[PDB]
């Protein structure tokens, strides 16, 4: 798992303990925790393999962030906040919510001001409410002067260098995530390179490599939950998803100042530790490097995923209706390829 | 089936009788037998539905053909002749025989002169041999002067008009087929429009429409038997091909002077009647009409087949190896689309 709980500086005791981690049916090895100066870490990023960097100072300035400081300086723009009656926040692509009407979301998005979120947070706390929230907002110009000072204080010199070394595309956005303890963003993968910077609280991150596609069972590309796993990690349906019993993960727990590199196309499960208080994180999404001129065989796992994704995309276009993708695909393999 | 056996002119009795037809597990309706002057026949071709035309005079000149006449005038070019130890002649695409080495053909092609074929035919006849032959050769310039007179005598005015009316492409070839009684070309489909002209002997033709794809189970596109059914019509494996129990066919028996229109992408099973003597046929293959500018939805069955075929073609190219088409496709649908 995440190895023995790290000890805080100043003999402040274990940062967190096992009882704070949820229980799952699969085994996991620990993700490496190295210094950005360590050549081994530079080797893991270059080979698009996860690695937790402990000293980057990527978001040094934000480490002082907490609800009061942000409400005070985050500005007056709107902030997306998802609601849930469960600890699981499954993502829903609203634009895709037309292809599937027999579908109803378990997480509602709601725009609101920062002070409204903090207060909404506080009400629940006192009235003993089981309801949960998760703020997920892209950072944009409409933020306070102090926050703009912090942002500019991030270690751009180090990250822009990584950007350069890996050939990545432009930085597409910085997502700010503030969630309640126990909150869980279920397994899924993103089509961008991600430098996950922990600011406040502790988060358990379980990753699975691209070649684990067959064990994770993503929803159909045209479905609102495209890029997410259909497997309930709390109650896995082995009859529908047999290969989930063969899934092996990479795990770790990040805290204030840790930067987790989540390679593009790598599956991730993120959970804010139980009873650890709220959590704050800011991610850095970069477009992947362009496809090389000469294709090398055998193809990489992530490339096959890219292919399967396009097949489903073209088929949905060609048939004129995503609902026909399934029946055509089955007809194509039944008694022919299976 | 093929309706009541037609009666020959001059009270020559039934042309053929039921006992000459093999037995199969599926039901069939009879293909329509109309006059080329009948508007209903023009309606069936326009809607790409089979129809047997009785008066076209398409190959009037060849009706006098028989082994002696051809050996005498067919010329001295080479003639492809397939050998078989069974009554079934499954087609094999030699260029594709590298992607599958765990494969060995049941029909051998052998080049030879026409007189060699006739004599090979005769030897078997006397020595009681169970071995079977099937001559299948494209007609080309290296043929006799008399045969060139016949060919030119075909009813080009009628067929070139059909070519025009349907928007078809150029005539790609004329296949000459001479086979022994009992010979069977198993179910498969061609990517061209076909006007099947019977010259000598009787042939039973069982067709299945394009939408029957799911019940016929064609081999993978990269396999040597691409475009053929994996179902043994004599011993159907219902465990591997369950939907074959839902197959319904269109049937008929053509004789000297009948022209069967086999629409492109329509499945066909051809069998020379048992104990009816050798059979002679000449087909006319035309490229289909180009794809219309505006695509109309819902898509036609044959169009979906075209799509499935391309998917398998691109996937085989993209993965760098046709052997990986299957595993990628299964991985794409297991627990996702099925």
């Amino acid at each position: 798992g995440s190895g023995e709980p790290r000890e805080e500086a100043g003999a402040l005791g274990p940062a967190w303990d096992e009882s704070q981690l949820r229980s799952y049916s699969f085994p996991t090895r620990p993700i490496p925790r190295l210094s950005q100066s360590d050549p081994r870490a530079e080797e893991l990023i270059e080979n698009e393999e996860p690695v937790v960097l402990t000293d980057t100072n990527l978001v040094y300035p934000a480490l002082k962030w907490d609800l009061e400081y942000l409400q005070e300086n985050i500005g007056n723009g709107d902030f997306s906040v998802y609601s849930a009656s469960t600890h699981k926040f499954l993502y829903y692509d609203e634009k895709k919510m037309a292809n599937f009407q027999n579908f109803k979301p378990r997480s509602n998005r709601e725009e609101m001001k920062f002070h409204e979120f903090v207060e909404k947070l506080q009400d629940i706390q006192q009235r003993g409410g089981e309801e949960r929230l998760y703020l997920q907002q892209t950072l944009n110009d409409t933020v306070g002067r102090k926050i703009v000072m912090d942002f500019l204080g991030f270690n751009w010199n180090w990250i822009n260098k990584q950007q350069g070394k890996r050939g990545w595309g432009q930085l597409t956005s910085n997502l700010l995530l503030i969630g309640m303890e126990g909150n869980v963003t279920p397994a899924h993968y993103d089509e961008q390179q991600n430098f996950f910077a922990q600011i406040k609280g502790y988060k358990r991150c379980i990753l699975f490599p691209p070649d684990q596609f067959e064990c994770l069972y993503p929803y159909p590309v045209h479905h609102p939950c495209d890029r997410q796993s259909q497997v309930d990690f709390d109650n896995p349906d082995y009859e529908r998803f047999p290969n989930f019993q063969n899934v092996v993960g990479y795990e770790t727990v990040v805290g204030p100042g840790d930067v987790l590199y989540i390679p593009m196309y790598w599956w991730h499960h993120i959970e804010s530790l139980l009873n650890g208080g709220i959590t704050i994180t800011v991610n850095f999404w970069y477009k992947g490097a362009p496809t090389p001129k000469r294709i090398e065989y055998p193809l990489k796992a992530h490339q096959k995923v890219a292919i399967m994704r396009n097949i489903e995309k073209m088929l949905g276009e060609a048939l004129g209706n995503p609902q026909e993708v399934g029946p055509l695909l089955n007809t194509m393999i039944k008694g022919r390829y299976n | 089936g093929s309706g009541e056996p037609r009666e020959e002119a001059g009270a020559l009795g039934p042309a053929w009788d039921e006992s000459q037809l093999r037995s199969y597990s599926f039901p069939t309706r009879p293909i329509p037998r109309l006059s080329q002057s009948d508007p209903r026949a023009e309606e069936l071709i326009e809607n790409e539905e089979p129809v047997v035309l009785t008066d076209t005079n398409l190959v009037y000149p060849a009706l006098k053909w028989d082994l002696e006449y051809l050996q005498e005038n067919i010329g001295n070019g080479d003639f492809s002749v397939y050998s078989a130890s069974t009554h079934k002649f499954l087609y094999y695409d030699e260029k594709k025989m590298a992607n599958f080495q765990n494969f060995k053909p049941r029909s051998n092609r052998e080049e030879m002169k026409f007189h060699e074929f006739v004599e090979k035919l005769q030897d078997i006849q006397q020595r009681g041999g169970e071995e079977r032959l099937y001559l299948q050769q494209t007609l080309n310039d290296t043929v006799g002067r008399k045969i060139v007179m016949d060919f030119l005598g075909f009813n080009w005015n009628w067929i070139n008009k059909q070519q025009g009316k349907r928007g078809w492409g150029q005539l790609t070839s004329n296949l000459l087929l001479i086979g022994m009684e009992g010979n069977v070309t198993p179910a498969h489909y061609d990517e061209q429009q076909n006007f099947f002209a019977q010259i000598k002997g009787y042939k039973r033709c069982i067709l299945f429409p394009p939408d029957q794809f799911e019940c016929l189970y064609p081999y993978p596109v990269h396999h040597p038997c691409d475009r053929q059914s994996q179902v043994d019509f004599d011993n159907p494996d219902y465990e591997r091909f369950p939907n074959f129990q839902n197959v319904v066919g269109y049937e008929t028996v053509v004789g000297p002077g009948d022209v069967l229109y086999i629409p492109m992408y329509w499945w066909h099973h051809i069998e020379s009647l048992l104990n009816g003597g050798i059979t002679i046929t000449v087909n006319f293959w035309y490229k289909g009409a180009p794809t219309p500018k505006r695509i109309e939805y819902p898509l036609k069955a044959h169009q979906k087949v075209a799509i499935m075929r391309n998917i398998e073609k691109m996937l085989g190219e993209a993965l760098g190896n046709p052997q990986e088409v299957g595993p990628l496709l299964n991985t794409m649908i297991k627990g996702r689309y099925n």
């Binding site: 993502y91 993103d190 999404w285 | -």
Partner: peptide, 15 residues
Amino acid sequence: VVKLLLEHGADVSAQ
């Protein structure tokens, strides 16, 4: 062809 199949989107878990 294959390069086109290879080409990827940039969809993230963000509405």
